[PDB]
Amino acid sequence: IETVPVKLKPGMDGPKVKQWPLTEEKIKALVEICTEMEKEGKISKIGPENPYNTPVFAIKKSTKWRKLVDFRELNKRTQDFWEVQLGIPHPAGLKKKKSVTVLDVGDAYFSVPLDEDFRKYTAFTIPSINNETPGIRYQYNVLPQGWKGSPAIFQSSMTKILEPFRKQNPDIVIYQYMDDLYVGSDLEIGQHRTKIEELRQHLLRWGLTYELHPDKWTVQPIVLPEKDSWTVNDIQKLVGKLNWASQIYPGIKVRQLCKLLRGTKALTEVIPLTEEAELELAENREILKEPVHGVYYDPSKDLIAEIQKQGQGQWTYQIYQEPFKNLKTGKYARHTNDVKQLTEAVQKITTESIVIWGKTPKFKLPIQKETWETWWTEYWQATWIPEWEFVNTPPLVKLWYQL
């Protein structure tokens, strides 16, 4: 087969990201795997004249070790190719479906040779314990998994493969993103599942050996309590919340509410509700359950996601492009391991984000950089990696999104 030549962004150079230290068990797994990919000719050993590097890890998908390459740098340095030059259009109908199923079609790429002059940029390194030997270095000879260039390049082979299946069920939406296919229908759940098995067989003739329910995605509104007795404290909290909300949702009002908090009163003190505040309250509740008037998705901007830890296994999140113009808010819940849950939450959020916008968000993560870096691998099950940075949640933000 003939290879599509690939060009970096002019000026800027390949990736030189250093390999994180790995536990012996994962090294063992990576060796086995890579020894086998090398026999099969997908990768080849490389000399010191290759300066570039990309991190690699082992995840568990199922109890077989899988190999995961972190191409975030590459992808960023490659962006022009897989987004502007080629690049899959994203269907608005995908999010509208009753059921969406995600299939791994990464094995497809291993059958297509990678542009010979691009290979050096796919370099990765298996480390050794205590630096006893030098790492083992490889680059890729075929479309690698996790590189946004691979689906970009395999795109036309993918259209060919899916065309019969698309012709026969023209109300099913199929969306490709990185190593995955996203398949959406409105069929009853059993017919949907049957239609996915049919698809697998199409995939199967070409070497490609869980369900979402997006309709039932709805806002996690900033929720206002329904107290029996109110205290100054509770009203103060109410005002703070509405005070937050009002910077996001046009129409929020707090005046009739403050009138109650008049003078210098003890926090623990009960005060009955003004007839007007009682209307204000309900009127604000109307506004929160609805989408934000004035906020729209700009396809040219990065997505961001903030996650707050609520305790008791609950996690709140928002997605936006410009701070606190929220495109979506939600929650996730339930191994009382903080990092495990957090890892789970990021993948759910990332997945929804792909279904909705065909884009992955940069995460603001409420955890110590080093802690997350040491552990996220142990629970990661996706084939991509979002961009993340680390943040100290503003104490106020957390309570305002409680439930």
Ligand X SMILES: CCCCn1c(C(=O)c2cc(C)cc(C#N)c2)c(C(C)C)c(=O)[nH]c1=O
The residues that touch ligand X, with contacts defined as CB under 6 A, are: 89, 94-97, 100, 173, 175, 182-184, 212-214, 296
Contact 141, 36 (CB under 8 A): no
DSSP 111: G
What x-and-dash track marks residues 48-87 binding its own copies by CB under 8 A? xxxxxx-------------------------xxxxxxxxx
* Three-class secondary structure of residue 65 per DSSP: coil
Position with the least CB separation from ligand X: 184
Q: Which of residues 245-274 bind its own copies (CB under 8 A)?
A: 254, 258, 261-268
- Contact partner at residue 153 from ligand X, its own copies, none, CB < 5 to 8 Å by partner kind: its own copies
Q: Read off the tokens for 377.
A: 């691998």
Instruction: State how far the alpha carbon of 80 is from the alpha carbons of 63, 113, 139, 259, 262, in Å.
Output: 37, 20, 22, 56, 59
Contact in structure between 104 and 176 (CB atoms under 8 Å): no
- List the single partner that 212 binds among its own copies, ligand X, none, CB under 5 to 8 Å by kind: ligand X
The least CB distance from residue 367 to its own copies, in Å, is 4
Least Å from the CB of residue 89 to ligand X: 4
- The site partner of 214 among its own copies, ligand X, none (C-beta below 5 to 8 Å per kind) is ligand X
The angle at the Cα of 79, spanning 46 to 112, to the nearest 5 degrees, equals: 50
Residues between 149 and 208 that touch its own copies (CB under 8 A) = 149, 152-153, 155-156, 159, 173-176
C-beta of 197 vs 370, nearer to ligand X: 197
Dihedrals phi, psi of 282, to nearest 5 degrees: -60, -40
Number of residues this chain uses to bind its own copies (CB under 8 A): 112
Q: Which is nearer to ligand X, 197 or 226 (CB)?
A: 197
309 contacts its own copies (rule: CB under 8 A): yes
Instruction: Establish whether 186 is an annotated binding residue.
Output: no
Strands (E), 9-155: 43-45, 56-59, 66-69, 99-104, 124-126, 136-140
Q: What's the burial of 323, exposed, middle or buried (CB within 10 Å: 0-12/13-18/19+)?
A: exposed
Q: Which is nearer to ligand X, 69 or 173 (CB)?
A: 173
Shortest spacing between CB 322 and its own copies, in angstroms: 20
**Edge-to-edge strand order for the sheet containing 314-320?**
326-333, 314-320, 304-311, 362-365, 388-390
80 is in an annotated binding site: no
Binding status of residue 300 toward its own copies by CB under 8 A = no
Structure tokens at 376: 């996220």
Among 236, 256, 274, 314, binds its own copies (CB under 8 A): 236
Q: Quick check: 99 and 185 in contact, CB under 8 A?
A: yes
Least distance to its own copies, CB of residue 22, Å: 7
117 is in an annotated binding site: no
Nearest Cα to Cα of residue 273 among 242, 235, 236: 235
Query: 157, exposed or middle or buried, with CB in 10 Å at 0-12, 13-18, 19+?
Result: middle
Between 133 and 190, name the residue whose CB sits nearer to its own copies: 133
Among 60, 66, 137, 193, contact with its own copies (rule: CB under 8 A): 137
Residues in the annotated binding site: 104, 179-180
Residues in the annotated binding site for Mg(2+): 104, 179-180
